[PDB]
From Swiss-Prot:
Effect upon mutating L29I: In a sporadic cancer; somatic mutation
Annotated effect of mutating M141K: In sporadic cancers; somatic mutation
Effect of Y62N: In sporadic cancers; somatic mutation
Result of changing G10V: In sporadic cancers; somatic mutation
Name under which the protein is recorded: Cellular tumor antigen p53
Documented effect of changing R175G: In sporadic cancers; somatic mutation
Listed result of changing P145S: In sporadic cancers; somatic mutation
Residues of the full protein shown: 96 to 290 of 393
Result when mutating G174V: In sporadic cancers; somatic mutation
Outcome recorded upon mutating Q64R: In sporadic cancers; somatic mutation
Documented effect of changing L91V: In sporadic cancers; somatic mutation
Effect listed in the UniProt record for changing S124T: In LFS; germline mutation and in a sporadic cancer; somatic mutation
Effect listed in the UniProt record for changing N30K: In sporadic cancers; somatic mutation
Length: 185
């Protein structure tokens, strides 16, 4: 099957916000450009605070319809390049969170990383999670565009909110964003 990518703010008004160049986001393209394994700050914005026990899941899928049913995973080379937490096959790793869970779906084999939802920190109206992408789009992905889907869920896995963004992991993010944005125009 294919995970839904439909935007859903839900009851809590959930949506994402974003911040040489290691990571840069294009609102026009709803696309994040980042370097391999570097810190990617993704902000969680809500209108009302979800309950304790709420969880935040990140999962990658292929954007192109002809490859949507495929599981996004690291190429063989990058499975060997680690924190000893993220399974080597996982594309998305969370940095700086002691409670990251790395999961593999029983039936779909899709990977995801989950962390507990935390209310915004002082000096901020949002919660920031630091993600790292462990394989280049050109590797595996082999130049195919991927989407990262972030879902806000309750403790039993029920959907509370969903948002998503395209991602390109590349050596020169700033330059590639510029290229794709200029092309858009
Ligand atoms: Zn790779």
């Amino acid at each position: 099957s294919v995970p839904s990518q439909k935007t859903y703010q839900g009851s809590y008004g959930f949506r994402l916000g974003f911040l040489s160049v290691t990571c840069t986001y294009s609102p026009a393209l709803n696309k994040l450009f980042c370097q391999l394994a570097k810190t990617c700050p993704v902000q969680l914005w809500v209108d009302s605070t979800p309950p304790p026990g709420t969880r935040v899941r990140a999962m990658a899928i292929y954007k192109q319809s002809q490859r949507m049913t495929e599981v996004v995973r690291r190429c063989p080379h990058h499975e060997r390049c680690s924190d000893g937490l993220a399974p080597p096959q996982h594309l998305i790793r969370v940095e700086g969170n002691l409670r990251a869970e790395y999961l593999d779906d029983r039936n779909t084999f899709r990977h995801s990383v989950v962390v507990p939802y935390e209310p915004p920190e002082v000096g901020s109206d949002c919660t920031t999670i630091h993600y790292n992408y462990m394989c280049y789009s050109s590797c595996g992905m082999n130049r195919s565009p991927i989407l990262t889907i972030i879902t806000l869920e309750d403790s039993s896995g029920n959907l509370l909110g969903r948002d998503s963004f395209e991602v390109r992991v590349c050596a020169c993010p700033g330059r590639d964003r510029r290229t794709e944005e200029e092309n858009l125009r």
